[PDB]
Amino acid sequence: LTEAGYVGEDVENIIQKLLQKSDYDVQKAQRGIVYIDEIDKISRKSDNPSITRDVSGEGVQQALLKLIEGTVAAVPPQGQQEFLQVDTSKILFICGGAFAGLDKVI
Amino acid sequence: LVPMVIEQTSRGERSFDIYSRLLKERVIFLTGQVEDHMANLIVAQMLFLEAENPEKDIYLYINSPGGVITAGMSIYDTMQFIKPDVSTICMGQAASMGAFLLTAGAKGKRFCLPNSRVMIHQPLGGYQGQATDIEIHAREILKVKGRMNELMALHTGQSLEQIERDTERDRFLSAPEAVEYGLVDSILTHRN
Amino acid sequence: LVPMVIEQTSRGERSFDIYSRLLKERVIFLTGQVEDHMANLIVAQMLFLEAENPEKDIYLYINSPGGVITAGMSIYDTMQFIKPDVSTICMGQAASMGAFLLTAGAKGKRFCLPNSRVMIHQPLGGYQGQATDIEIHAREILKVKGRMNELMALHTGQSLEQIERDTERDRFLSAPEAVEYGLVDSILTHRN
Amino acid sequence: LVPMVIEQTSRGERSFDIYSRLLKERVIFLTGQVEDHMANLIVAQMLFLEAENPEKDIYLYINSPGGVITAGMSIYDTMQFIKPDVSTICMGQAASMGAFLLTAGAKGKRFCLPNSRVMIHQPLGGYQGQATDIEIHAREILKVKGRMNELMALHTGQSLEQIERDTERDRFLSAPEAVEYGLVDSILTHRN
Amino acid sequence: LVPMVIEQTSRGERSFDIYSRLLKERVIFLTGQVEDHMANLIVAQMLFLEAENPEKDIYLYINSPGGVITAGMSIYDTMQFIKPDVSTICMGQAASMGAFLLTAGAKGKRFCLPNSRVMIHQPLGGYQGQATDIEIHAREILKVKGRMNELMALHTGQSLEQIERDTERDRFLSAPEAVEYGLVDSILTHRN
Amino acid sequence: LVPMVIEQTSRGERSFDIYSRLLKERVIFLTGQVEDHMANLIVAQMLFLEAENPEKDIYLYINSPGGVITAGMSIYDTMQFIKPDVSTICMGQAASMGAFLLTAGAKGKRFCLPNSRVMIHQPLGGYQGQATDIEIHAREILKVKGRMNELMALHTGQSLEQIERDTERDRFLSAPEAVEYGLVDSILTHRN
Amino acid sequence: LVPMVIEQTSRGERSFDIYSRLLKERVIFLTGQVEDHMANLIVAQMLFLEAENPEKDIYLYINSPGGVITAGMSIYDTMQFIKPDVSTICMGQAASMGAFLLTAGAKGKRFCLPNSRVMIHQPLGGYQGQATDIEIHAREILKVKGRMNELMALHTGQSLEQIERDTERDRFLSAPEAVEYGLVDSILTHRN
Amino acid sequence: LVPMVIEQTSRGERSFDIYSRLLKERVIFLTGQVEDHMANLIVAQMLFLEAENPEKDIYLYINSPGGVITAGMSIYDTMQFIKPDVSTICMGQAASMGAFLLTAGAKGKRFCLPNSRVMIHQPLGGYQGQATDIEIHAREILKVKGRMNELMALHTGQSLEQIERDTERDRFLSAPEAVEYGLVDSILTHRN
């Protein structure tokens, strides 16, 4: 995942995979579950001042803020002419990571 | 040489020398003969610590056979000027100037190790030249002696006459004796 | 050994020596014998601080027994040349050159700690050689003596005649005595 | 010229000095004549190690021909004050001041190598001046000798009179003899 | 110690030495006795600044008490060779070599502080050996004296005979006198 | 000046000193006069190597004209204390102290170059003072001589009387002779 | 100290000292007495520059008052060995060895500043011992003198007899005189 | 100081000192007097180069006036022990110890500059003491002289008797003469 407007993958691509499991049904996709992995890698890499925009780091978190809380995302029709609208207000998002070094902070 | 230590922080590991590491903890070392150059380092450190936390105390470890009076006075004035209370701990020994700075700490925050000696004596000087210049320098040192006795009397709490008679010649005091005299307030034997 | 300090800033964390850290706050230390090398170093700091912000006052701490006049005049000229005011604070002692630079600060911004020894005396020199060369150097040092007396009289405010009589022999002035004499403006006892 | 070592950890490669690397293992080296500067360095290291782990023991290898009494007492007081038990290992030699610190370690943790010499002698001093000043200094050193003997008697377990008689003149002891005398309690022949 | 300063740039923050930072501004310091080692250092700085911008003038601060003529001549030739105009400012004092280099700057860009002193004298030398060698060295120094007088006359603008008469013995010149004599162009008393 | 070397590793690039690079390979250099400061550096290296890997041999290169006995014994005890075998290689020369450490290596790991000198002699010392003090130091030096002779016999395999007779005066032994005498095990002339 | 400059090279920004920055441009400085340590440093730089570009010209500034012939000869051999031409520029002074290296530059690439002094003299030496040893050293110094004279004639173009006759005693040659004598090719006054 | 150079490689740009830069190309510098400290430095470099590539020859530049025989022997043994061939090049001069190491290189890989000077002499020493101990040292120096001559004859190829006759007193050999004597294989005059 990466911030919008870059070569990297977009956050909306996550919902695209969900549609496939739901037979491309928006009603069924608006009540599914999602398990994000490697969430500990998007953490700021000792760049709190934000000298450069962490598209692969902080940039991913910013885009996911509205996704976890709930927002009508525009997912590609299949995988831009239609931009199917999928509401993520009732979709659960699980985040799994290793957080190597977090023990020192605690 | 001075060893290097690593401090663990949330951001990451950082390398600092042994003395710099203790500086972050508001600890200042006063070792060796007191002079203008070493005095400025102490003054700069004390001023730097005041800005970081003008409320937390500052610890000053005194271990030296005295030194120049002018250089020592700069530390004393800085110690009294800065709002933070400066706690003085005597390690090994504290000569005339070292003892003056030891007793110049905040009330109730002047400590000394169980096995340490405190020495106090009148200022030592000297000048060679014309008789007219001798009187000028002779009177100047006399004023310093009187001024230092007044300051020591105020901190120790004893009468000015007592300080003059006791400081007329070299006087050695132990840790328990320093407490009774008033140079220090307590003795640190073991960590509770 | 100069201890290192950590400065926390939004841009990041940077490590600087104790002296460099105070330099960022427009603080310059003048300690030890006054010479061309140390004096030249002070000149660079003043010029650097002026470029950064020629509006904030520059603080100069003087604690030295004096030195060559030529080196001192270099600092005095720089202080008067740069538009920002150069606040002078005396800690410890201030000899002829130290006192001359101490009184050379901006009017109303010259301070001294309560326990400070300010000393002022006429220039010292000496030459060996042919009588013709002795006369040349004798006139040169005399001109320097008169030039320094005029400058000191200007900052102190006292008449040139009084400065000459007081500068003929070594004169020691305490912090309160320096205020009334005009060398300093006020005394810094405690913060706020 | 000291060699550099690399420490491997999850954070990454870390560069260290031979002495700095051993400091992480709670190992302090006491070498050369005991003085205030080197003594303060050891005091800082002991305090630093206490903060990291006030439970783990510190290993202070002692190899020195002795030194200043005041400087040595600062180390002795620090070892007794800090909660951790300081283990002293004698390698090469341990003179009066060095032997005093060797026997100042925690009970059951004062080690000595098979080939090492321990020398215990009374304090050495000297003063030049008037008779009144000589008596003050002569009496002061006597108190140090008496105080030093009492501390050694407590750690070694010998009677005060026995220590005074043995320390009246230089007395050399070997690793096995030091065990019976009480300076140490074991010999490190081979690692087990 | 040489303080360190931080320079703000678009790429980021770069730490520069006090003297190194001023070098970026085309400012070179000439302090202390003139010798071959420092002379080559100044020559390297002048050459480096010329390549960076051969159209911007270079500022040279002179506060040296003079030195070797050969070492100084290297600086003089370098200043005249490089196309950029070298501006010389006298701080503190300027002896024979210092004065020669001070007046060697580009016409109209030579400045002297109000209290700076300038002294000019004939070359100093000597030799021990056979009479033939004495004549060889005696003639060489004489040529240097004549060559230096001609160069000084060209920059100062005074007659060759006048320079010779004034250079027979040390001649101290103040800032106002240097302007009249032609050694400097103006006096920098204030920023504006 | 010690040249720097780069160690290329899959993880990344790294820089090391000439001696530091060899330290990673369990190699220690013993050069110059033997003293407490240099001895501690060697002891620290041995302790560091033991902690890194206690199952790998340590190579020590000896090239020195000897030195203090206490400093040397501090290294001898460390070799036997640590379980890793300490291989000793003689380069250039190995004097009394150097020879003692050369023969102190693990059996079968004592090597010497074809062109190397080995000298063994009784301990050298001296003391001045009262007759009573002379006896104390005289008896101690004699005990050290006997103790060193016993250790030499154990490592070399020679009888006590033979070592005493050969050690009474300086005895120079070449590399081939050192093999028969037992000071070394083999001679390394070429790499196979 | 040596100032540090920054080069805005492609792909990054690096900070190098003034001397290192000029070395990257094929510029070598030869300052001070000629000795083995400084001579080897120059030889290393010349060999390094050959690797980067064995075709670009190399510049060597000469401002030395001479030195050991053996140390200087090492530089001369390197200059004539490496394929790149070596351009010698005389700045300030150039003694016998310095002048010898000045003439060792490639034909048409030997320059000299206007106010530069070149002094050429026969080798200086000395030995004390037995008459037999005196003859050995006396013959060697004479051979070295003849060898240097032959090299001087080859580079300068003067006849061998002329070089020997003019080298008997110190011979001072100015910049224009050096061109006529053949020591240098041209004089650099201003950039054209 | 030592200039710093940048090396371009696949990883990126790396900063190296002049000596460290040449160490990568298997080039070792032997400058100044031969002693134990510098000798060990060369030994460490030779061993380091052997591990990096035991099939590439090592170049050793010898420019020294001699030194301790034991220190030089450590380098000689290392050169013969390591499988890689060591190429010796004489720059400036090569005294007894330097000449011995110069001729100790691999046959056919020994070079000398055209103006280099090589001198060979018998070992020099001395001892002060009794008649019994002096005989030991006086007998050891002869053994070193004999062993030194044997090695010199083996590498040079001349008979042992001839070496003794030529080594009795100082003998200077030029670059061409060294070739006939066998000390060098060829002379390097230009790069082809």
Side-chain angles (χ1 to χ4, degrees):
Chain A
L1 303 173
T2 61
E3 192 174 2
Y6 283 72
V7 65
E9 191 178 6
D10 295 358
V11 300
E12 289 72 8
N13 300 124
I14 295 163
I15 309 306
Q16 193 69 2
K17 305 174 185 177
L18 197 77
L19 273 297
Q20 295 179 352
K21 306 297 184 61
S22 71
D23 306 330
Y24 288 88
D25 190 333
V26 67
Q27 300 300 84
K28 300 295 188 63
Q30 287 176 131
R31 58 178 63 183
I33 311 295
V34 177
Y35 165 74
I36 296 162
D37 202 340
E38 302 296 348
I39 198 69
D40 64 330
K41 299 294 176 294
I42 56 170
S43 176
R44 293 172 290 188
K45 283 83 75 172
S46 59
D47 53 75
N48 287 87
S50 303
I51 300 105
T52 308
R53 52 173 51 266
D54 284 16
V55 296
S56 180
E58 182 178 3
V60 185
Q61 303 180 33
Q62 297 173 353
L64 292 163
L65 304 185
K66 294 299 303 310
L67 190 67
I68 310 311
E69 184 178 1
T71 185
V72 174
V75 303
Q78 201 171 21
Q80 65 84 17
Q81 183 61 288
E82 314 303 342
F83 271 115
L84 292 167
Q85 52 180 4
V86 182
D87 189 1
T88 69
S89 299
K90 298 180 179 180
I91 295 174
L92 182 62
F93 295 86
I94 299 92
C95 302
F99 287 79
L102 180 61
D103 56 356
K104 304 299 185 63
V105 176
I106 301 167
Chain B
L1 52 79
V2 300
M4 307 300 294
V5 298
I6 298 302
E7 180 184 3
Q8 290 295 353
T9 70
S10 302
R11 300 183 178 275
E13 72 288 358
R14 55 195 67 181
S15 179
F16 297 137
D17 46 304
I18 190 66
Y19 295 109
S20 298
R21 180 63 178 87
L22 272 62
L23 182 60
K24 289 177 61 54
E25 307 301 340
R26 311 187 68 79
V27 175
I28 298 172
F29 284 88
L30 191 168
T31 308
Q33 184 189 359
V34 180
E35 58 169 358
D36 300 67
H37 291 85
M38 68 87 71
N40 281 33
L41 276 304
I42 294 166
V43 170
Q45 291 171 76
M46 293 167 68
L47 293 174
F48 168 84
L49 293 175
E50 184 188 16
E52 294 294 348
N53 281 323
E55 303 295 349
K56 297 189 72 175
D57 298 338
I58 296 170
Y59 302 93
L60 179 65
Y61 300 164
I62 299 169
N63 180 13
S64 57
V68 180
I69 299 87
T70 58
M73 284 296 161
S74 60
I75 299 170
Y76 167 84
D77 294 329
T78 304
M79 192 187 303
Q80 302 296 330
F81 178 88
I82 64 183
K83 285 168 62 178
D85 284 2
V86 179
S87 180
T88 60
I89 295 84
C90 179
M91 315 189 308
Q93 66 164 350
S96 55
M97 176 42 59
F100 184 86
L101 299 178
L102 175 66
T103 187
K107 279 282 287 183
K109 303 191 184 184
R110 304 172 297 179
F111 315 96
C112 63
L113 302 175
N115 304 275
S116 58
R117 291 293 187 275
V118 182
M119 175 176 169
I120 54 174
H121 61 67
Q122 56 183 320
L124 273 62
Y127 179 88
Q128 48 278 15
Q130 293 183 355
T132 304
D133 300 332
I134 294 286
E135 176 63 6
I136 292 168
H137 289 257
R139 287 188 294 92
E140 181 60 17
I141 186 169
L142 262 295
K143 293 181 186 301
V144 175
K145 174 179 175 180
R147 177 57 172 175
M148 286 181 63
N149 291 338
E150 291 174 355
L151 297 180
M152 184 173 293
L154 187 154
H155 288 281
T156 57
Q158 297 186 347
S159 61
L160 182 64
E161 287 68 9
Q162 188 64 35
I163 294 291
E164 295 175 354
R165 285 188 287 91
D166 295 337
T167 200
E168 196 67 7
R169 289 188 176 275
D170 298 359
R171 190 187 189 87
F172 293 93
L173 297 80
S174 60
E177 295 177 356
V179 174
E180 297 180 356
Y181 201 81
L183 296 165
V184 293
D185 302 325
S186 178
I187 296 168
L188 301 175
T189 313
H190 298 292
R191 183 168 299 245
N192 304 126
Chain C
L1 181 60
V2 304
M4 308 300 292
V5 292
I6 289 288
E7 183 183 357
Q8 292 299 139
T9 59
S10 300
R11 298 186 296 271
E13 60 179 350
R14 293 165 177 78
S15 181
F16 307 99
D17 47 308
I18 190 67
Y19 285 113
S20 300
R21 180 62 178 87
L22 272 61
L23 181 58
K24 291 179 64 55
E25 306 303 338
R26 314 183 71 81
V27 177
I28 299 171
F29 283 85
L30 190 169
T31 178
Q33 199 71 228
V34 182
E35 54 173 354
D36 299 335
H37 290 84
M38 67 86 70
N40 186 24
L41 186 67
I42 291 170
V43 171
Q45 301 180 59
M46 292 181 175
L47 298 175
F48 167 82
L49 292 176
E50 184 191 12
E52 291 295 345
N53 184 7
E55 300 294 350
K56 298 294 101 178
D57 295 357
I58 296 170
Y59 303 92
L60 181 65
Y61 300 170
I62 300 166
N63 180 13
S64 55
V68 299
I69 298 88
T70 57
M73 302 316 299
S74 180
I75 299 169
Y76 168 86
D77 292 332
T78 307
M79 295 163 57
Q80 301 294 323
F81 175 88
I82 64 183
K83 188 172 69 60
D85 292 329
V86 178
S87 180
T88 60
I89 295 163
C90 174
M91 61 190 189
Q93 65 171 351
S96 54
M97 303 313 306
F100 184 82
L101 297 173
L102 172 63
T103 189
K107 193 75 175 186
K109 308 189 183 189
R110 302 167 296 178
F111 314 96
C112 69
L113 305 183
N115 300 279
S116 61
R117 297 293 111 178
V118 180
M119 174 181 172
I120 57 179
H121 59 258
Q122 57 183 324
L124 309 182
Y127 186 84
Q128 298 180 2
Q130 289 185 125
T132 301
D133 296 332
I134 296 287
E135 208 290 331
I136 295 293
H137 286 63
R139 290 179 59 266
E140 177 58 18
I141 190 174
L142 260 294
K143 288 177 179 178
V144 174
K145 174 178 177 179
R147 177 57 171 174
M148 291 182 66
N149 290 336
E150 291 177 1
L151 297 177
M152 184 174 293
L154 180 66
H155 296 280
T156 57
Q158 296 186 347
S159 61
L160 178 57
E161 297 182 359
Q162 193 62 37
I163 293 289
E164 294 175 353
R165 288 193 297 271
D166 300 357
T167 309
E168 273 291 352
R169 296 278 185 174
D170 293 0
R171 192 182 195 86
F172 292 91
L173 302 175
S174 180
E177 299 180 357
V179 175
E180 59 81 16
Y181 195 89
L183 293 170
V184 296
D185 298 319
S186 59
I187 297 168
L188 298 175
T189 59
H190 300 80
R191 181 158 300 248
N192 181 271
Chain D
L1 176 56
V2 300
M4 285 285 188
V5 297
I6 303 302
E7 183 64 11
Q8 287 292 3
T9 180
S10 302
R11 293 280 187 173
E13 311 198 46
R14 200 177 300 171
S15 58
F16 272 117
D17 292 313
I18 192 71
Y19 296 110
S20 301
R21 177 60 178 85
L22 270 55
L23 184 58
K24 296 185 71 177
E25 308 300 341
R26 309 184 68 81
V27 175
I28 302 174
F29 289 91
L30 184 154
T31 305
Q33 211 74 16
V34 182
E35 56 173 356
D36 301 64
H37 292 86
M38 67 86 73
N40 278 267
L41 201 68
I42 293 169
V43 169
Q45 294 168 252
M46 289 180 176
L47 296 172
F48 166 85
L49 293 178
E50 182 190 19
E52 259 63 26
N53 283 324
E55 302 297 345
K56 296 174 81 67
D57 304 337
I58 303 175
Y59 298 88
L60 176 68
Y61 293 83
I62 293 167
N63 177 14
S64 64
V68 183
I69 300 292
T70 60
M73 294 318 299
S74 60
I75 299 169
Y76 167 85
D77 290 326
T78 305
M79 292 189 301
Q80 302 296 130
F81 175 86
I82 63 180
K83 194 193 297 299
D85 289 345
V86 179
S87 181
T88 58
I89 306 92
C90 172
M91 61 183 187
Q93 65 167 344
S96 60
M97 200 66 257
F100 185 82
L101 302 177
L102 174 67
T103 186
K107 289 285 286 296
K109 309 193 185 184
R110 304 170 297 176
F111 307 98
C112 69
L113 276 46
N115 298 276
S116 62
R117 312 301 301 184
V118 183
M119 179 187 183
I120 46 173
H121 61 73
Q122 56 182 327
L124 309 182
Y127 183 88
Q128 305 289 337
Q130 300 180 345
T132 304
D133 298 328
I134 292 165
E135 173 59 14
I136 296 168
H137 286 66
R139 171 164 46 86
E140 174 59 16
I141 184 166
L142 288 176
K143 294 183 181 179
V144 174
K145 176 182 175 182
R147 176 56 173 176
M148 196 69 64
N149 292 332
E150 292 174 355
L151 296 174
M152 181 169 291
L154 185 155
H155 287 279
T156 59
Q158 296 285 3
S159 60
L160 179 57
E161 287 68 14
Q162 184 61 230
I163 296 297
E164 186 174 359
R165 294 197 299 273
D166 294 332
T167 59
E168 197 67 8
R169 285 187 175 276
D170 301 355
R171 185 154 182 272
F172 291 91
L173 298 173
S174 58
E177 297 177 358
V179 176
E180 287 87 46
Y181 200 78
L183 296 162
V184 293
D185 38 29
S186 54
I187 296 169
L188 295 172
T189 315
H190 283 63
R191 192 167 295 243
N192 307 124
Chain E
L1 184 61
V2 193
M4 277 290 186
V5 299
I6 295 301
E7 180 182 4
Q8 290 295 350
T9 66
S10 60
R11 307 190 186 188
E13 291 69 17
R14 185 60 50 82
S15 181
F16 275 103
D17 187 70
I18 190 64
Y19 291 110
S20 301
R21 171 56 187 277
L22 268 62
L23 184 60
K24 286 284 293 308
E25 309 301 340
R26 313 186 69 81
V27 175
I28 300 171
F29 288 87
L30 193 169
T31 177
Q33 195 73 359
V34 179
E35 56 170 354
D36 297 333
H37 292 99
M38 68 165 282
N40 287 115
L41 195 70
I42 291 170
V43 168
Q45 293 176 75
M46 290 181 177
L47 296 173
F48 173 81
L49 294 174
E50 182 186 38
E52 292 293 350
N53 193 327
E55 297 184 3
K56 293 287 289 301
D57 59 359
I58 297 170
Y59 297 90
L60 181 64
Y61 298 172
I62 297 168
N63 189 11
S64 58
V68 184
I69 292 167
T70 59
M73 280 298 178
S74 62
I75 300 170
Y76 167 84
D77 292 326
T78 303
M79 292 189 300
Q80 299 293 322
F81 174 88
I82 63 182
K83 179 157 59 179
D85 292 2
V86 182
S87 179
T88 60
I89 299 84
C90 180
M91 312 189 311
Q93 66 168 351
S96 52
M97 300 313 307
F100 183 83
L101 296 177
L102 176 67
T103 187
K107 182 170 288 186
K109 300 188 178 184
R110 302 174 297 178
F111 311 99
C112 182
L113 276 46
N115 294 273
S116 284
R117 310 299 300 186
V118 184
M119 190 264 289
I120 53 175
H121 58 249
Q122 55 183 327
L124 298 174
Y127 186 86
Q128 281 71 16
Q130 296 178 341
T132 301
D133 299 329
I134 292 287
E135 177 61 10
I136 294 170
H137 287 257
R139 287 189 291 92
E140 179 62 13
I141 191 172
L142 258 294
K143 292 174 183 175
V144 173
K145 174 180 172 182
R147 178 58 174 174
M148 285 181 65
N149 290 338
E150 292 176 355
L151 296 176
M152 185 173 292
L154 186 156
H155 293 286
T156 57
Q158 294 188 348
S159 61
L160 180 59
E161 53 271 13
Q162 185 60 25
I163 294 292
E164 294 176 358
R165 288 192 295 272
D166 295 329
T167 53
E168 296 301 339
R169 301 182 174 278
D170 297 1
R171 198 169 198 273
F172 293 89
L173 290 164
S174 61
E177 299 175 353
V179 174
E180 196 283 338
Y181 201 84
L183 292 166
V184 297
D185 303 316
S186 60
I187 296 167
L188 295 174
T189 183
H190 289 90
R191 179 130 298 246
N192 54 14
Chain F
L1 187 146
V2 300
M4 304 292 291
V5 298
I6 295 301
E7 180 182 1
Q8 292 295 129
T9 310
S10 59
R11 185 183 303 277
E13 192 166 50
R14 195 156 51 264
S15 182
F16 290 108
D17 310 335
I18 187 61
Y19 296 107
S20 298
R21 179 62 177 87
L22 271 63
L23 180 54
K24 296 174 64 56
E25 312 302 345
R26 312 188 69 81
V27 176
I28 301 171
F29 285 86
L30 191 166
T31 311
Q33 203 66 219
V34 180
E35 54 174 353
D36 300 336
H37 294 100
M38 67 85 69
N40 278 87
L41 200 70
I42 293 167
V43 171
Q45 292 166 256
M46 291 180 175
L47 297 176
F48 162 81
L49 293 177
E50 183 186 13
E52 293 295 347
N53 186 289
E55 304 297 346
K56 284 171 180 179
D57 301 340
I58 297 170
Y59 303 89
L60 178 66
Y61 300 171
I62 299 168
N63 181 16
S64 56
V68 181
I69 302 87
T70 59
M73 299 309 296
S74 173
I75 298 169
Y76 167 91
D77 290 326
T78 306
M79 294 174 170
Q80 308 300 327
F81 173 70
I82 69 185
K83 58 184 297 304
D85 290 354
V86 179
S87 179
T88 59
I89 295 163
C90 173
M91 316 189 309
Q93 67 165 350
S96 56
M97 203 66 256
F100 179 82
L101 298 175
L102 176 66
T103 186
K107 288 181 62 52
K109 302 184 185 299
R110 304 172 297 175
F111 309 96
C112 182
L113 299 175
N115 298 277
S116 297
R117 298 292 101 177
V118 181
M119 181 179 66
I120 57 181
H121 61 66
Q122 57 184 327
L124 275 61
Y127 181 86
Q128 305 183 0
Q130 288 182 327
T132 301
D133 299 331
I134 293 286
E135 174 59 12
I136 304 304
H137 288 61
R139 183 172 67 268
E140 188 276 349
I141 185 64
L142 261 294
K143 287 190 294 183
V144 172
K145 172 181 174 181
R147 178 57 173 176
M148 291 186 68
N149 291 337
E150 291 174 359
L151 300 179
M152 289 284 291
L154 182 147
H155 293 287
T156 61
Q158 303 293 68
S159 61
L160 269 291
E161 61 182 1
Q162 191 63 42
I163 294 290
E164 294 176 358
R165 289 195 301 270
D166 299 334
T167 311
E168 270 294 354
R169 290 186 176 275
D170 298 2
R171 178 174 175 84
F172 290 88
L173 296 173
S174 59
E177 298 179 358
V179 175
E180 288 87 43
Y181 202 85
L183 292 166
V184 299
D185 302 320
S186 60
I187 292 168
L188 300 177
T189 185
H190 280 74
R191 182 170 300 248
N192 308 124
Chain G
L1 70 174
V2 302
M4 301 296 293
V5 300
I6 48 164
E7 180 184 1
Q8 293 177 335
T9 186
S10 62
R11 201 186 58 78
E13 188 177 12
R14 307 167 302 191
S15 181
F16 304 142
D17 61 82
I18 190 67
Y19 292 115
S20 289
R21 179 61 177 87
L22 271 62
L23 178 59
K24 189 186 183 65
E25 302 292 346
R26 312 187 70 80
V27 174
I28 301 171
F29 277 80
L30 192 165
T31 304
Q33 284 282 339
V34 183
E35 56 175 350
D36 301 334
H37 294 283
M38 69 86 72
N40 283 88
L41 193 73
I42 293 169
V43 170
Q45 295 174 68
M46 293 175 67
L47 295 174
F48 173 79
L49 294 176
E50 186 182 22
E52 281 76 57
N53 193 320
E55 303 296 348
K56 284 177 69 59
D57 191 5
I58 295 172
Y59 300 90
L60 178 66
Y61 298 170
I62 298 167
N63 189 13
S64 60
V68 181
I69 292 169
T70 59
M73 278 295 181
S74 64
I75 301 171
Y76 167 82
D77 291 324
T78 304
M79 292 168 62
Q80 302 298 326
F81 177 83
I82 66 183
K83 270 172 60 176
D85 291 355
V86 182
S87 179
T88 58
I89 296 162
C90 178
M91 317 187 309
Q93 187 182 21
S96 52
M97 178 39 60
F100 175 82
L101 298 176
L102 177 64
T103 65
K107 288 285 289 184
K109 301 190 178 185
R110 303 171 298 177
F111 310 98
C112 182
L113 274 43
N115 301 276
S116 288
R117 278 166 46 185
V118 181
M119 192 271 291
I120 56 181
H121 67 77
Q122 57 180 325
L124 289 163
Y127 183 86
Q128 59 183 3
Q130 291 180 329
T132 302
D133 303 354
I134 292 286
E135 187 181 6
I136 296 292
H137 287 69
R139 290 158 45 192
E140 192 62 18
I141 185 65
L142 264 292
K143 287 187 294 186
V144 171
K145 172 179 175 179
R147 177 58 174 175
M148 287 179 62
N149 291 334
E150 293 174 359
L151 298 179
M152 290 286 291
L154 187 151
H155 292 282
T156 64
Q158 301 291 135
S159 60
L160 183 61
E161 297 183 356
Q162 191 66 234
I163 294 290
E164 296 175 349
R165 169 167 49 265
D166 295 334
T167 309
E168 295 298 347
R169 296 184 178 278
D170 294 1
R171 174 61 176 276
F172 287 95
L173 294 168
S174 64
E177 297 175 358
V179 175
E180 297 296 346
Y181 201 82
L183 297 169
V184 294
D185 301 319
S186 180
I187 294 167
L188 300 175
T189 60
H190 302 77
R191 302 203 74 118
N192 293 271
Chain H
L1 68 173
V2 176
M4 305 298 294
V5 298
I6 295 288
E7 180 179 358
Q8 286 288 7
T9 173
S10 59
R11 283 285 183 175
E13 289 178 350
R14 177 166 52 268
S15 181
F16 271 117
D17 61 81
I18 192 68
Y19 293 111
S20 291
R21 185 63 183 83
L22 272 61
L23 180 60
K24 284 192 72 179
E25 286 74 10
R26 315 184 70 80
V27 175
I28 299 170
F29 281 87
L30 190 165
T31 309
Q33 281 278 131
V34 180
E35 57 175 355
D36 300 332
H37 292 82
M38 69 88 70
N40 282 262
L41 199 72
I42 293 168
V43 170
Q45 295 174 72
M46 289 182 175
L47 297 174
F48 168 82
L49 295 175
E50 184 187 22
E52 185 177 5
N53 186 289
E55 294 294 349
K56 284 173 69 61
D57 56 0
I58 297 168
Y59 319 103
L60 179 66
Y61 299 173
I62 297 166
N63 178 15
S64 58
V68 183
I69 292 80
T70 60
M73 276 294 168
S74 60
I75 300 168
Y76 173 87
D77 293 326
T78 304
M79 293 165 56
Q80 303 296 318
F81 174 87
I82 64 184
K83 168 172 170 58
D85 293 336
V86 179
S87 179
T88 58
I89 295 164
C90 176
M91 316 188 308
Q93 67 166 350
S96 55
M97 199 67 257
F100 180 80
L101 301 177
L102 175 64
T103 187
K107 185 180 291 300
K109 298 192 181 185
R110 301 170 298 177
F111 313 100
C112 188
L113 302 179
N115 296 276
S116 285
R117 294 289 177 174
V118 180
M119 188 267 289
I120 52 177
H121 64 64
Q122 57 179 327
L124 273 63
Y127 182 89
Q128 294 75 14
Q130 296 181 326
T132 301
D133 57 9
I134 193 178
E135 187 278 343
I136 302 299
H137 293 258
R139 177 161 53 88
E140 184 63 15
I141 195 70
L142 267 290
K143 291 181 181 177
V144 175
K145 177 178 176 181
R147 178 58 174 175
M148 194 69 63
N149 293 332
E150 290 175 0
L151 297 176
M152 188 81 71
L154 185 145
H155 292 282
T156 57
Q158 295 186 342
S159 61
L160 179 59
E161 295 183 354
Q162 185 60 23
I163 294 290
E164 297 174 356
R165 300 164 188 168
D166 299 324
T167 310
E168 273 293 357
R169 293 190 178 276
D170 294 6
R171 175 161 158 79
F172 294 86
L173 294 82
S174 180
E177 300 178 0
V179 176
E180 286 83 47
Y181 202 85
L183 292 166
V184 186
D185 301 322
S186 61
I187 294 167
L188 298 173
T189 316
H190 282 81
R191 173 167 301 293
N192 303 329

